[PDB]
Amino acid sequence: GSNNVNDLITVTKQMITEGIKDDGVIQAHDGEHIIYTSDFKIDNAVKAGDTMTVKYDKHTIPSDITDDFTPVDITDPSGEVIAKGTFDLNTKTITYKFTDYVDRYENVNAKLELNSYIDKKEVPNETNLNLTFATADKETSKNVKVEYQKPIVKDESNIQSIFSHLDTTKHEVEQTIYVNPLKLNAKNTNVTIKSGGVADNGDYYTGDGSTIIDSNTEIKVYKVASGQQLPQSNKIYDYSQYEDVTNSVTINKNYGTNMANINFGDIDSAYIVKVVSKYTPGAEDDLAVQQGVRMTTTNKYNYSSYAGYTNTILST
Ligand SMILES: [Ca+2]
Ligand SMILES: [Ca+2]
C-alpha cells in the first residue's frame, strides 16, 4: 500500500534561482521568489493516480501573504496536465498525483518550476541560509542571505510596515506597523494610517492602490518592552507576547477620508500597530491595494519631523 513512485522518477537537472536578481541575497520584503526548477524523466511504469513528492526548504513557503498554498500543475510544453498537486504545510511537501497523461503517453520527461517565498515564521531575522530543495531521491542546495527592510528615519520619527496578510474572500488586508522600532524618545508621537500613499518624507499621495478605512476598521496597538527585540521580518506570530495598549492611546478612525490617526503622546518605547482594513475587489481578480503610514514627532528644534512608509499589492 503505497502509490508513491519517486523511485521511478529520474531527476536529470535541478536548480535554485532567484526572482529579482541572482544575488545570493533574497530581498524578502520586495517579494523576491526563491525558484526551484527540476527536470525529470517519468518511467513508463508510472500510472494514473500514482504520486510523487517534492520538498520545499523549511525556510520557504508557497505564499508569504495568503494561506492558499495550491501548487502549480506539472504540465507538458502545451500545458497538458501531467500531475496535480496538494501542499502540506507542516512538512512543506507537495504530493503530485499523476493524471491519465501517464497512461496515454510513454517515454515522458517533464519540467517543473516552483515559486516560493521566505517563510517569516522560520526566518524571524536577517540570516544566512543553506537552502535545500528536494525531488526525492535528489537534492540541490544554495547558500543565500535573507535581507529585510529598514525603517525610514527622520530625527525621532522612525517607522516601517508590511502587508502581513491578505484575505481575498473577505477582502481584508492586514498591515503590521513598527512604530519607533529604534526605541527613541519620540515627543508628541502621532501615526496616521491612510489609503493610498505616504512618501518617505511624509507627503501624502493618491498612489496606485486603495483601502477602506472607517469606523469599522480594526486597529490594535501593542507596547514593546525595552528588553524585547522585534523580528526584522516585520511579522508577529504571537501578539499575546506584547502589551495590548489599544485603550491607552487616542485613535481617531475618521481622521480624514479613509484615514485614521493614533495619538501616542510622548513615548520611549517601540510599538506594534496591527491594522485590518477592507479593500475594493477588482472585477476580474485584479488587486490594487495600497495603504501608507506617517509618523509625526516634535524634533529638538520644536518643529514636526515626518517619516513615511507605503505597502502596495498589485495584480494582473
Ligand atoms: Ca536576489
Ligand atoms: Ca505509464
Numbering used by the authors: 1 to 316
Task: Reproduce text from the manuscript describing this model.
S. aureus bone sialoprotein-binding protein (Bbp) is an allelic variant of SdrE. The gene identified from chromosomal DNA isolated from S. aureus subsp. aureusTCH60 encodes bone sialoprotein-binding protein (Bbp) with 1149 amino acids, containing SD-repeats of 154 residues and the ligand-binding A region from 53 to 601 residues further divided into N1, N2 and N3 domains. S. aureus isolated from patients suffering from septic arthritis and osteomyelitis specifically interacts with bone sialoprotein (BSP), a noncollagenous protein of bone and dentine extracellular matrix, mediated by Bbp. As a bifunctional MSCRAMM, Bbp also recognizes the human Fg α chain and inhibits thrombin induced blood coagulation.
